[PDB]
Design a protein around this ligand. Sequence first.
Ligand SMILES: C[C@@H](CS)C(=O)N1CCC[C@@H]1C(=O)O
Lengths: 144, 148
Amino acid sequence: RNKNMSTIYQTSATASAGRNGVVSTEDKLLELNLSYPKEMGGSGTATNPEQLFAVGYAACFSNAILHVAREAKVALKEAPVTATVGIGPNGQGGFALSVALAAHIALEDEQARQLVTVAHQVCPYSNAVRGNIDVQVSVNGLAL
Amino acid sequence: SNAMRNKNMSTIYQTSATASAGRNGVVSTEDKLLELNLSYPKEMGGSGTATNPEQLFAVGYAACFSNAILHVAREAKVALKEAPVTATVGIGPNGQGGFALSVALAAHIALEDEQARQLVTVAHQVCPYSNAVRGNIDVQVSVNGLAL
Ligand SMILES: C[C@@H](CS)C(=O)N1CCC[C@@H]1C(=O)O
């Protein structure tokens, strides 16, 4: 489930001032300023690793749903996904993420459900956090 | 996996983003601090002209891990001006019909030997990304070119 058996795509990024400086892909396709959010005492003038994870997870899960749709020959124009990410202490000295994913799919409900369930199985963010984060997944307003 | 080490016991910060992905996708945070175009990479049947979830994961994990190192150096009163971290992320098939990420974290800091190992080991226990992927991804962590 967890082994990447043959790398199809590889990328890299470098940061040096943690949550409060610049971060960029080594190809420079993506170059971003980061700052602490207001909730953490910062300026909120820029993004942060929690928002990045939300953006990337929403995008990965949306890609995943469209992937499965293509494979099932289901014509889906869009697969909007809202990802909500929280961060707090884990009580052992570190920090942990909590995640909710809300998918909105123009299909009959049982069908949408099946599709999104398979997508959650195949999505590499989902495989990455499986058993660590209990990702709360819903499809068209209903929890899976 | 370890569920327990991943209980968010009380939320300090919460954020939301909505993506409509694909070949011409878009994602934006609820508050628009971040609005991005998405594409599949050229390696994956796309145009590779905008970003993608692996790049976003790499930028996020690199920043998170750099911060984790500075955080532990601060607590330990070890003077670091900075903590360069390169995060390398790959995606490929898993053999069960899905996809998996592979990740390396390469730190380059002004501290060595067992002290640096101890410090970066601590940073890797506390970083939320590392706790999210523990046991699933075997994150290859190195400091100053050497295995953690
Ligand atoms: C660039 C990646 C998004 S992480 C992708 O296009 N896909 C579609 C196939 C693998 C993966 C997925 O989400 O399941």
